[PDB]
Each structure stands twice: as structure tokens, then as C-alpha cells.
């Protein structure tokens, strides 16, 4: 794999370059949202973001070297986490707000438009602010997101040793970023640990999100794309 040869800088530039585009929501000022329209907007956006996430995944160093099935497994396991850390990262400069899209900026309220959505909002909002207080950098964000992609589903599988090899490389890249920013040796590992611990909560937010999306599927209504349903069934 060519991923292991890359330097810290090379790993970085390759990740920033792989970044998915920011997508817009179905504009329509008709406020306020009901529940069907709210979930409709989120579902459609997520469905469109997914297509790009796959392009992004294939550009994450080491992901291409994986068997198609391995790649499928990983994405199926971590797709919501990846969407969430993205949402969280976009919302950083909007305290008390979730930037689903540049034209879709929802605050604490409006989470009530959907039952059981306010709880998800607050965890997301909490993660966003945590990132903000840590002053998370873009180069660190891409590192975190790629880590989720490779790690989330690796313990549910030579090919695994490969993934862990790449994961170590991304860790090297993280410490390198922190070293360049002028952090002491100790501040480097403390920050590293801090960031990774947040991944545990992003996993948590994802699990809750998943089970809701079911009830909303089982109870029908809010038409989900076949792509979503397929990603969903991989968690049921």
C-alpha cells in the first residue's frame, strides 16, 4: 500500500484534498417545519452527502487497498458517525447551532419539530462546542474523520493488520500536527487522547440516531432512499 510511504505532510494534503463538498438543503423559507418536512430535509441532505462520502472514502489513503467487501463493511458501520463529525465540524463557528447546510441552520429549538430529536441535537451541540473550546483545526478534523472510517468497523471483521497500520500512520500525522503547532510532548498526547475520547461519544450519538431512524422506518412515513435503507439494515 502506498499509504504507509506517505509523510505527515503528504498524509495531510491528501486528506484536505479528499474533503467532500458542502451541500445545500432544499431551499424553502416556509417556516416553521413540521415533522415530515424536517425529517425530509435531513434525509435528503444525508442521502446526497453519502454519494460524496464514498468518493471521499476511496481517496482516504489505504481505503482503496481494501477488498470491496471490507470497504462496504466499514462504510456501513460508520456512515452516520462520519456525517455527524462533519455536521459537528461545520457547526463549530455557530455556537448553539447545527449547520446542516449553509442554508439550513437549526438552533436548539426546532429540534422539537421532531419527537426525540432534541436529545440528539444537544449531544451534537455539546460535541460541536467541545470541538470549539479545544480549537479543533481542519487538519485535525480530517484526521479524526478518516480514523472513524477505518476504526469503527475494524473489530467486526492481514487486512485488519493493514488497517491498524494505516490508523497508526494517521496517529503519527496527528501528533505531527500538534508538534508543528508548538505543543509540548505532554500536551500532544493529552490532546490526542482528548480528541479520540470524543470519537467514543460520536459513536454514541450514532447508535442513538440509528435506532430512531428505525422506528421512523418501521413506523413508515418520512420516505427514506433505498441507499439509506441499505445502510440502515446493516445495523439491524
Amino acid at each position: 500500500s502506498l499509504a504507509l510511504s506517505l509523510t505527515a505532510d503528504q498524509m495531510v494534503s491528501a486528506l484536505l484534498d479528499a474533503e467532500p463538498p458542502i451541500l445545500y438543503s432544499e431551499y424553502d423559507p416556509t417556516r416553521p417545519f413540521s415533522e415530515a418536512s424536517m425529517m425530509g430535509l435531513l434525509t435528503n441532505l444525508a442521502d446526497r452527502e453519502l454519494v460524496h462520502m464514498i468518493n471521499w472514502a476511496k481517496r482516504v489513503p489505504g481505503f482503496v487497498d481494501l477488498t470491496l467487501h471490507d470497504q462496504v463493511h466499514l462504510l456501513e458501520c460508520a456512515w452516520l458517525e462520519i456525517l455527524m463529525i462533519g455536521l459537528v465540524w461545520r457547526s463549530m463557528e455557530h455556537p448553539g447551532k447545527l449547520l446542516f447546510a449553509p442554508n439550513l441552520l437549526l438552533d436548539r429549538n426546532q429540534g422539537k419539530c421532531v419527537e426525540g430529536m432534541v436529545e440528539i441535537f444537544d449531544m451534537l451541540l455539546a460535541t460541536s462546542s467541545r470541538f470549539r473550546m479545544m480549537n479543533l483545526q481542519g487538519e485535525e478534523f480530517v484526521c479524526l474523520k478518516s480514523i472513524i472510517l477505518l476504526n469503527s468497523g475494524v473489530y467486526t471483521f492481514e487486512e485488519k493488520d493493514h488497517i491498524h497500520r494505516v490508523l497508526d500512520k494517521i496517529t503519527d500525522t496527528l501528533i505531527h500536527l500538534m508538534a508543528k503547532a508548538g505543543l509540548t510532548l505532554q500536551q500532544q498526547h493529552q490532546r490526542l487522547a482528548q480528541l479520540l475520547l470524543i470519537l467514543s461519544h460520536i459513536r454514541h450519538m450514532s447508535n442513538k440516531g440509528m435506532e430512531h431512524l428505525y422506528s421512523m422506518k418501521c413506523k413508515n412515513v418520512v420516505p427514506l432512499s433505498d441507499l439509506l435503507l441499505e445502510m440502515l439494515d446493516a445495523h439491524r
Binding site: 454519494v51 464514498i54 472514502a57 470491496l68 462496504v72 462504510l75 456501513e76 441507499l227
Partner: peptide, 12 residues
């Protein structure tokens, strides 16, 4: 058969 299979194979 999975839509995910197509998108991964036709990735750009």
C-alpha cells in the same frame, strides 16, 4: 446486490 457496491466501484 447493493447500491453501495455501485458507488464504490464507480467512485470518482
Amino acid at each position: 446486490h447493493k447500491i453501495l457496491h455501485r458507488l464504490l466501484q464507480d467512485s470518482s
